[PDB]
Paper text:
Fine mapping of the T cell responses using shorter 13/14-mer synthetic peptides based on in silico binding prediction (Andreatta et al., 2015) was used to isolate five HLA-DR1-restricted epitopes for further analysis in four HLA-DR1+ donors: M117-30-SGP, M1129-142-GLI, M1208-222-QAR, NP302-314-DPF, and PB-1410-422-GMF. M117-30-SGP showed the second highest conservation, at 97.9% in swine and 99.1% in human, but 85.2% in avian strains. Interestingly, both of these epitopes were found to be least immunogenic in both our mouse and human data. M1208-222-QAR specific repertoires were also directed to a single TRAV gene (TRAV38-2/DVB8, mean = 50%, n = 4; mainly coupled with TRAJ44, TRAJ45, and TRAJ49) and to a much lesser extent a single TRBV gene (TRBV20-1, 23%, n = 4). This was followed by M117-30-SGP that exhibited two TRAV gene biases (TRAV13-2, mean = 27%, n = 4; TRAV23/DV6, mean = 35%, n = 4) but no obvious TRBV gene bias. We generated peptide omit maps, observed density maps, and conducted atomic-B-factor analysis of core and flanking amino acids to confirm that observed core 9-mers matched those predicted by NetMHCIIPan 3.1. Subsequently, inspection of the starkly contrasting electrostatic surfaces of these epitopes led us to look for sequence enrichments in the cognate CDR3 sequences that reflected simple biochemical complementarities (for example, opposite charge or shared hydrophobicity). At the simplest level, they included measurable enrichments in total CDR3 charge or CDR3 hydrophobicity, which were clearly complementary to the surface electrostatics of pHLA crystal structures (highly acidic surface of HLA-DR1-SGP and highly basic surface of HLA-DR1-PKY), as well as the hydrophobic central surface of HLA-DR1-QAR. Although dominant motifs were not evident in public CDR3α sequences, specifically for M117-30-SGP and HA306-318-PKY, positional enrichments of single amino acids of like charge were apparent in multiple shared sequences.
Numbering used by the authors:
A (entry chain CCC): 5 to 18
B (entry chain BBB): 0 to 190
C (entry chain AAA): 3 to 182
The structure:
Amino acid sequence: SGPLKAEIAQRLED
Amino acid sequence: MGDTRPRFLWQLKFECHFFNGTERVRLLERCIYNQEESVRFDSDVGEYRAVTELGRPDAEYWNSQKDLLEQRRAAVDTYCRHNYGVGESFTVQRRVEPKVTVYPSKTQPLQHHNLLVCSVSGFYPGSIEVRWFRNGQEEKAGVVSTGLIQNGDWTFQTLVMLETVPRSGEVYTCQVEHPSVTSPLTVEWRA
Amino acid sequence: EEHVIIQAEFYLNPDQSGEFMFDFDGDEIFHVDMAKKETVWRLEEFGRFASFEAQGALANIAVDKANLEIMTKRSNYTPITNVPPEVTVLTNSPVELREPNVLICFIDKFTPPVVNVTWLRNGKPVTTGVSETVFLPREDHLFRKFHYLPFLPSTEDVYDCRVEHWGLDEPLLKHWEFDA
């Protein structure tokens, strides 16, 4: 009953 | 597998907890290197937190990006409550009625039937109440169960067993209560 | 308290395996297949009431690879300790002779998520009809898997789930047979 959203992964500090 | 090179695993889990519909919502971002959780965002805190020493660096780093903290504090609304609304009609509201069977069995292989099985299967969701009766009187003792079992296809099943000596003339009733029905499911077995 | 939605991804080296899935209360809503880059729904009906742009998933596996590399180096290459699985083999419902049913194989409490799983009929491996889930998450950070095999039940037919995993010194078999 809509589109599902994925939360975004965050790169670590190299 | 004929292969013994070491392995390295990284996992990321975003969990939304709902309580009392959408009225209270708690989000958790965890990441996990090789079975140890290193760092966590909890919506009850609004900051990242290291869980082990290995992840104190990555907490400090993420905690310094204010565009990121702001997004994550809002996610309880833009993500959690979002996906809840999208999913509700077919997850929260999903309901499948159980098939109920009774059949007699044996605790030992070549002895007498001394065990009534109450099989309850294909139901959803998972909260059930299953009760045994002899002659309209609930039997609380001698009951074992498989526990609630998840088939992995959005159905559940359970076996609930009554260890009994079946004396002829006795009526046993397995009684099941479940959100998908407004009054108790019952099946009878005549000794 | 009442309901839990989980978005779970992982990346595993050096196999280079990714997974991405959504899980409602222990049951899977969908996963994304890396190979085809498309959304697979656990039930066909879900495709009819919901949508998901699978490009978001691809994008997250990319970041998780980059992350795993960093974490690997920083731990000084300390590798995962293999945790062998519990396995049970159950029926869909009480089995009657000549009534189609479904053997389930539950693989549980293991890591990392590589696992070889065969069904055996009277010793011989069985392909036709088998299907399985992707690896599902757990609070303890181990994995769960299900395999399935629809079958027509009979007196003179026995089955086994055969599971091999790096944390097991021998293949683990779980038997089932018609009892009456």
